[PDB]
Design a protein around this motif. Sequence first.
Motif, PDB file in Angstrom:
ATOM      1  N   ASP A 266      -3.412  -1.334   8.474  1.00 18.46           N
ATOM      2  CA  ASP A 266      -2.712  -2.251   7.571  1.00 18.46           C
ATOM      3  C   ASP A 266      -2.012  -3.492   8.142  1.00 18.46           C
ATOM      4  O   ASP A 266      -2.347  -3.810   8.919  1.00 18.46           O
TER       5      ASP A 266
ATOM      6  N   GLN B 248      -4.434  -6.657  -1.139  1.00 10.99           N
ATOM      7  CA  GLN B 248      -4.128  -7.595  -0.530  1.00 10.99           C
ATOM      8  C   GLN B 248      -4.750  -9.001  -1.229  1.00 10.99           C
ATOM      9  O   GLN B 248      -5.741  -9.338  -0.644  1.00 10.99           O
TER      10      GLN B 248
ATOM     11  N   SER C 143      -3.914 -12.497   8.941  1.00 12.98           N
ATOM     12  CA  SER C 143      -2.729 -12.860   7.961  1.00 12.98           C
ATOM     13  C   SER C 143      -1.941 -13.910   8.003  1.00 12.98           C
ATOM     14  O   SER C 143      -2.281 -14.707   8.800  1.00 12.98           O
ATOM     15  N   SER C 144      -0.707 -14.203   7.435  1.00 16.14           N
ATOM     16  CA  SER C 144       0.291 -15.336   7.654  1.00 16.14           C
ATOM     17  C   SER C 144       1.156 -15.158   8.987  1.00 16.14           C
ATOM     18  O   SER C 144       1.258 -15.922   9.826  1.00 16.14           O
TER      19      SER C 144
ATOM     20  N   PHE D  18      -2.703 -26.485  -2.728  1.00 11.84           N
ATOM     21  CA  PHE D  18      -1.853 -25.303  -2.995  1.00 11.84           C
ATOM     22  C   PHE D  18      -1.287 -24.384  -2.001  1.00 11.84           C
ATOM     23  O   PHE D  18      -1.825 -24.589  -0.889  1.00 11.84           O
ATOM     24  N   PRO D  19      -0.270 -23.754  -2.070  1.00  9.97           N
ATOM     25  CA  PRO D  19       0.202 -23.007  -1.200  1.00  9.97           C
ATOM     26  C   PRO D  19      -0.708 -21.969  -0.588  1.00  9.97           C
ATOM     27  O   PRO D  19      -0.965 -21.185  -1.565  1.00  9.97           O
ATOM     28  N   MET D  20      -0.903 -22.141   0.536  1.00 12.14           N
ATOM     29  CA  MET D  20      -2.075 -20.910   1.177  1.00 12.14           C
ATOM     30  C   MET D  20      -1.893 -20.848   2.605  1.00 12.14           C
ATOM     31  O   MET D  20      -1.628 -21.781   3.178  1.00 12.14           O
ATOM     32  N   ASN D  21      -2.657 -19.856   3.033  1.00 13.58           N
ATOM     33  CA  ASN D  21      -2.488 -19.543   4.425  1.00 13.58           C
ATOM     34  C   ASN D  21      -3.311 -20.340   5.303  1.00 13.58           C
ATOM     35  O   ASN D  21      -4.290 -20.631   4.813  1.00 13.58           O
TER      36      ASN D  21
ATOM     37  N   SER E 190      -6.027 -12.699  -1.868  1.00 16.18           N
ATOM     38  CA  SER E 190      -6.142 -13.931  -1.239  1.00 16.18           C
ATOM     39  C   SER E 190      -5.409 -15.324  -1.872  1.00 16.18           C
ATOM     40  O   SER E 190      -4.776 -14.874  -2.742  1.00 16.18           O
ATOM     41  N   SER E 191      -5.684 -16.317  -1.432  1.00 13.44           N
ATOM     42  CA  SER E 191      -5.278 -17.558  -1.957  1.00 13.44           C
ATOM     43  C   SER E 191      -5.809 -17.713  -3.309  1.00 13.44           C
ATOM     44  O   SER E 191      -4.925 -17.935  -4.396  1.00 13.44           O
TER      45      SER E 191
ATOM     46  N   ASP F 224       1.208 -12.987   0.311  1.00 13.64           N
ATOM     47  CA  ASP F 224       1.821 -12.310   1.491  1.00 13.64           C
ATOM     48  C   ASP F 224       3.392 -12.376   1.333  1.00 13.64           C
ATOM     49  O   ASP F 224       4.035 -11.133   1.796  1.00 13.64           O
TER      50      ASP F 224
ATOM     51  N   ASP G 203      -6.888 -19.067   6.036  1.00 14.48           N
ATOM     52  CA  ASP G 203      -7.582 -18.930   4.829  1.00 14.48           C
ATOM     53  C   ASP G 203      -8.181 -20.489   4.756  1.00 14.48           C
ATOM     54  O   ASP G 203      -9.573 -20.469   4.474  1.00 14.48           O
TER      55      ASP G 203
ATOM     56  N   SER H  26       0.828  -1.098   0.081  1.00  9.43           N
ATOM     57  CA  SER H  26       0.013   0.110   0.110  1.00  9.43           C
ATOM     58  C   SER H  26       0.812   1.265   0.062  1.00  9.43           C
ATOM     59  O   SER H  26       1.484   1.380   1.076  1.00  9.43           O
TER      60      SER H  26
END
Lengths: 512, 513
Positions: B158, A185, B188-189, B228-231, A187-188, A233, B234, A27
């Motif tokens: 943020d 931001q 977030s991660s 798949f690579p993801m948090n 997402s997956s 991220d 999520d 941002s």
Amino acid sequence: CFPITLKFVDVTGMISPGEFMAVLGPSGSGKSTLLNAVAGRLHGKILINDGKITKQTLKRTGFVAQDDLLYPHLTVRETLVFVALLRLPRSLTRDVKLRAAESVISELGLTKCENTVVGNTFIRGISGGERKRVSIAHELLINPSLLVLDEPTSGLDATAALRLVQTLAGLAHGKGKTVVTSIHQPSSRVFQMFDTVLLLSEGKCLFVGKGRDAMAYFESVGFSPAFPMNPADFLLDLAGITTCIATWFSQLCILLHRLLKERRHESFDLLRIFQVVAASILCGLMWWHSDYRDVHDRLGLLFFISIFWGVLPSFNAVFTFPQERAIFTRERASGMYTLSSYFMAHVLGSLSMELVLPASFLTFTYWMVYLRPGIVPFLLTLSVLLLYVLASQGLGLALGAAIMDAKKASTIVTVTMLAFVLTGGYYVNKVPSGMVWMKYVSTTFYCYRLLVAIQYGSGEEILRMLGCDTSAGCRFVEEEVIGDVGMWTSVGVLFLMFFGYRVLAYLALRRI
Amino acid sequence: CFPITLKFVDVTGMISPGEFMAVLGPSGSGKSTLLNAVAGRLHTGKILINDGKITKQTLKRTGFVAQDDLLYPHLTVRETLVFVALLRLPRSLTRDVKLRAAESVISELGLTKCENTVVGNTFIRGISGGERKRVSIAHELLINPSLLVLDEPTSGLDATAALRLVQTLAGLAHGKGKTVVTSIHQPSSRVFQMFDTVLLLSEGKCLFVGKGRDAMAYFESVGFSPAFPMNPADFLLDLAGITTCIATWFSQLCILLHRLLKERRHESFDLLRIFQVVAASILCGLMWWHSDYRDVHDRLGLLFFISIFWGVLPSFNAVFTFPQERAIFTRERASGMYTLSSYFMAHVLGSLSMELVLPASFLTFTYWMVYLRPGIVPFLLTLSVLLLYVLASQGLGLALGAAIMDAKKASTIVTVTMLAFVLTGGYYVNKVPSGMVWMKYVSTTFYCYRLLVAIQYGSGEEILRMLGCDTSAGCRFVEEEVIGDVGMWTSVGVLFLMFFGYRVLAYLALRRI
């Protein structure tokens, strides 16, 4: 759909047909500057189809900006057909434009909420996702080839953002379009649906290429994730005259038809009818069956009417121009309408819609206060009142169009109306020598004189019925019921002000 | 700094000292309901705190940081926090101890950088969202909470700010032995790795309870694994005495007055208001430049215009104060900061002090240019009458603003009432109908106008005999404007009675809601 190939040098990258590029950055990185420069709004070399930026290329590129400027009281289909009638070329028929609008509605999944008011935070209506879909459909009508949006999923939920990305990617993998976006931001699923990813940091580019290659590239460089995480991220953390006349009048007609609902909302407010009704009831109660012999009471009633109907519309007109400025600029930049058509449409709509309330007020008040009976006096006083209302609204519009701050305009208008009221001839008779000139620039003065002349005339009648043919008292009565100006001069000056204030408002608008 | 142990049955889970539990769920799942019930604001099942039923003694230890941040704009950070400390800390301790507690709270939350900075809002510039949230959290850190249950602290912030806030919130739980419980909208991660206990809510039902690190292994063992690579979060979301009382009251009033001074200054001393007042004064001094006492009709017009202006302005301006501070009033009265009486009297005294400067300057400029009655007694009397009239009109404005809690509807009603009052002031119409003569006695403008006329002219004999009336109907027209229907003392008495009664009615209306 014609293919568009994009090249920019000095940041550098390729955007090809069928590629869903997404600009990724922290941002404040500066994604908006590059996103705007790619479209061509900004004014290194950027090449479209191996050519320089020309207006022939710009007719097939769109821009769905972050700010959604939509008219509240219009339904989705009404809005889109109005856009289609004004944006599509005039050589085509009306049915073809309507069919194009309907095809645009159908292909964006807006069929569910076709007959639903758009609304805003105030008026209930469609949701944010449907608002963004309508915003995109606004520029989807001209069949763009280079669709560069700006933050489309901002402010939306995860499911809504995912579905919007689904539609945006389908519009690029089924129609051969070069959709270029930027996401705050990701997402997956949003990231895994990407095709090309651009990383920006302090204006400098960190990575160009396929989104799937980003992880392998970065782990080969020497930086790898340490825990289960979203890859985006990690990336962010690392970062003729007849034709012209026809066009003008068609534009005016369409704009008037479109702005009718806004005009209705502005004038017929339940918190305005209440004030008008209360004022009418109080006027009819305080002067119940008044007598012509009581000159001072009737003069006070006339002055109060002048004050009320000079203060209300003039103050009510200062909000319209500053509130629609963003829409005006955005749609004018696209060539939808020019200044003249928009200004005349607003003027005609306001003139049509700002006359019903005073007419009802006078119709109720005239036959209960026992003013001069007949038809000619009633019609004359109604015409005078309507002309005065229009002139005051002209001053309001001019001051609203001069400076573009609502509250400052309100304060200036209140000061001006106080100055006008304190020179109408009711409060002060011994005006100072150097202070006698401002009564000629007061609309209230002319309206009051016209009303007095209509109700009493030269004043001979009540002069002889009252008793005179004290001496000072009868001089006071006479100087109250004689005119310093003629009957026709007041009407002429009122019409001249009615035209001149609108002319000045148009000029002030032209400057900005 | 002392242990609080939490168990809830009917959703079920345990939160122990030193555990940073966070409630995770999709938007609309119902995390807010459970978070509020855990605090104790809700009023089947049992929520047991330290193996006991919820009591006010335990209610002290727990603290709630609501999502809505209600802060006074013009106050600096340290001024705000010391005012909070002086309000909600026990009265047995000294002032220095309360100030030191506020200073320590400032120091431990990283607010030292912006100590001398106006809080502000979207209008007035000041601190950022992160510092606003930190101040809001510091509001309830003064009572030394042991069970801190927040509500979406990182919403609207943020990534870096959210990560730093989570850092501070976890440090306050792993360095002070506090039971910190929050709920995050979309983690977030980096943020999710700092979670110690994760509760998943779906349609109010608990999908998973336990450690955050065990969620991935458990869900893989169940049969659902990422493709798949993801948090990870999520994936989780996708799956989802009388003397003491007097001292207390007066100290509360003093603190509230001191705190609200800046807001009162902002409300009254607006540049647009000063411009309007100056323009009105200049126009009044120009229209009646060196007026003559013999011209009675002109002077009466001037007096009526003054009455109209200073009855219309303050009554309308005072109608916004109460509706705009209701959220703050309710939130800080729930905690026990101040009662209704102290807040109401502080507002009344502040308005009285701050709403008299403009009319005084207006009259001081206007009196000696219009050439009104010379001397000192007439000027002082008319100034006092004008100030009393202004206060009475402001009383009506406050009462109507406190009756119905809507700004624009209140403005419309006030305008209608003031129009009705002005029309029956005795200047526009003299032949009042028989059935409408009673409405003159309920008008403040009527009494103010009569008082001004009686001050300037008196019984009117002097200008009557200098005018030559020492036709009869013509003299009656002059006489009926100077001769009043009420005495000089009845008007003052009724003005004082209205000044008190309107405030009394406003207080009663506030008491209802």
